[PDB]
Ligand binder design. Structure first.
Ligand SMILES: O=C(OC1CCOCC1)[C@H]1C[C@]2(CN1)C(=O)Nc1ccccc12
Ligand SMILES: [Zn+2]
Ligand SMILES: [Zn+2]
Length: 394
């Protein structure tokens, strides 16, 4: 896995992306790595925001599936034409794989200006693939066609005329023990659609939020490398903020700051990290009544953004935001940790990352186990729609 290290790049807040080739001869493209979707989609038309796109007509190996796909997000939208071609990852494994590619022909608010990626690589499970679960996702194709273990791992590393560049590693097919310190800890994948986990306890600076633990997972908690922020359900969010406000109270910030809408700044290098509390999410363990905590620093949830005006200032954006769709453990969280997506054992691994950013007082941590007597169920059960209910899976 030597040759897989440092295979991710991107700009801060705009996504981590891996270099993939597709087609024959190999058309080379930067692709966003996104564990919260399950389609492989590539720009195949010209767009204002694309330097270069997938040209099917220039690939001998391309096969058209004569099917359309249409894929809305909450923010953003794209549609395209389904097909298959040869695909490989230069700084990934030394194989080539035939895989489904959605060729994107039109899109509203999908491609980001300056982000330098032209596709998305969803690494979640078939259930949430579009247009339905029979479109075999890339990673399924990869395992099915090669001897590559059903596992991958992500180390997303940290962040004045452009955004900051970011780096990381996507290790396909196992674990690289130079990427993490300390113990590696695993929570169950509750269910294979999203990388859904369960949170059992939340502490802000060692203080329990003291909420029914269902609230932490309403209506779901997921891990999404293609979300920047830590997203939390409204009730959890508001308590988080009350508590972060509390400890930060020496400092008085405009509404817009906490809404993720505005920047706050200090003199170059005088930023007072110590009035901001660590956050600790306890995740369900592999053993019943067991949990383990990941602790993340203010350095993670305050995101540095380089001001053009006062460039003699360090300025930060609050990267916790509100959700109506449950908890999303995005890049803000992952950036503390080597995260291991162990699909073979239906589990997610966390360890402290060999690269994670910290001050001299505190450190992001993975620390367990903890035990609760008669730990109730913290899972939510999403109301079943009749649409959903009427689907046949044969
Ligand atoms: O569907 C996703 O994330 C949602 C978020 C909340 O959790 C449920 C799943 C993928 C696709 C994504 C980010 N990750 C998205 O949504 N817009 C968007 C826009 C550009 C790139 C990637 C995405
Ligand atoms: Zn049927
Ligand atoms: Zn099905």
């Amino acid at each position: 896995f030597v040759e897989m290290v440092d295979n991710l790049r991107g700009k801060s807040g705009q996504g981590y992306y891996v270099e993939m080739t597709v087609g024959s001869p190999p058309q080379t493209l930067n692709i966003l790595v996104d564990t919260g979707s399950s389609n492989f989609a590539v720009g195949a038309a010209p767009h204002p925001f694309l330097h270069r796109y997938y040209q099917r007509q220039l690939s001998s190996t391309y096969r058209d599936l004569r099917k359309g796909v249409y894929v809305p997000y909450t923010q953003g939208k794209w549609e395209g034409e389904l097909g298959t071609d040869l695909v490989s990852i230069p700084h990934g494994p030394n194989v080539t794989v035939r895989a489904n590619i959605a060729a994107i022909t039109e899109s509203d608010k999908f491609f980001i200006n300056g982000s330098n990626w032209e596709g998305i690589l969803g690494l979640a499970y078939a259930e949430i693939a579009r247009p339905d679960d029979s479109l075999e996702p890339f990673f399924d194709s990869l395992v099915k066609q090669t001897h590559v273990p059903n596992l991958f791992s992500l180390q997303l590393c940290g962040a004045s005329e452009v955004l900051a560049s970011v780096g990381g590693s996507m290790i396909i097919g196992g674990i690289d023990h130079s990427l993490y310190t300390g113990s590696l800890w695993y929570t169950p994948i509750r269910r294979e659609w999203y990388y859904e986990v369960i949170i059992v306890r939340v502490e802000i600076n060692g203080q329990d939020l003291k909420m029914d633990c269902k609230e932490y997972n309403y209506d779901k908690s997921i891990v999404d490398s293609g979300t920047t922020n830590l997203r939390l359900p409204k009730k959890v969010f508001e308590a988080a903020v009350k508590s972060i406000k509390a400890a930060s109270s020496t400092e008085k910030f405009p509404d817009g700051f906490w809404l993720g809408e505005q920047l706050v700044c200090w003199q170059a290098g005088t930023t007072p990290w110590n009035i901001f509390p660590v956050i600790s999410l306890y995740l369900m363990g592999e053993v019943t009544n067991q949990s383990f905590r990941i602790t993340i620093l203010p350095q993670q949830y305050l995101r540095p953004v380089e001001d053009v005006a006062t460039s003699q200032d360090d300025c930060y954006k609050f990267a916790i935001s509100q959700s109506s769709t449950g908890t999303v453990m995005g890049a803000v969280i992952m950036e503390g940790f080597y995260v291991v997506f162990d699909r073979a054992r239906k589990r997610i691994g966390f360890a402290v990352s060999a690269c994670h950013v910290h001050d001299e007082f505190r450190t992001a941590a993975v620390e367990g186990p903890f035990v609760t007597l008669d730990m109730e169920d913290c899972g939510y059960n999403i109301p079943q729609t009749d649409e959903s209910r009427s689907h046949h899976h044969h």
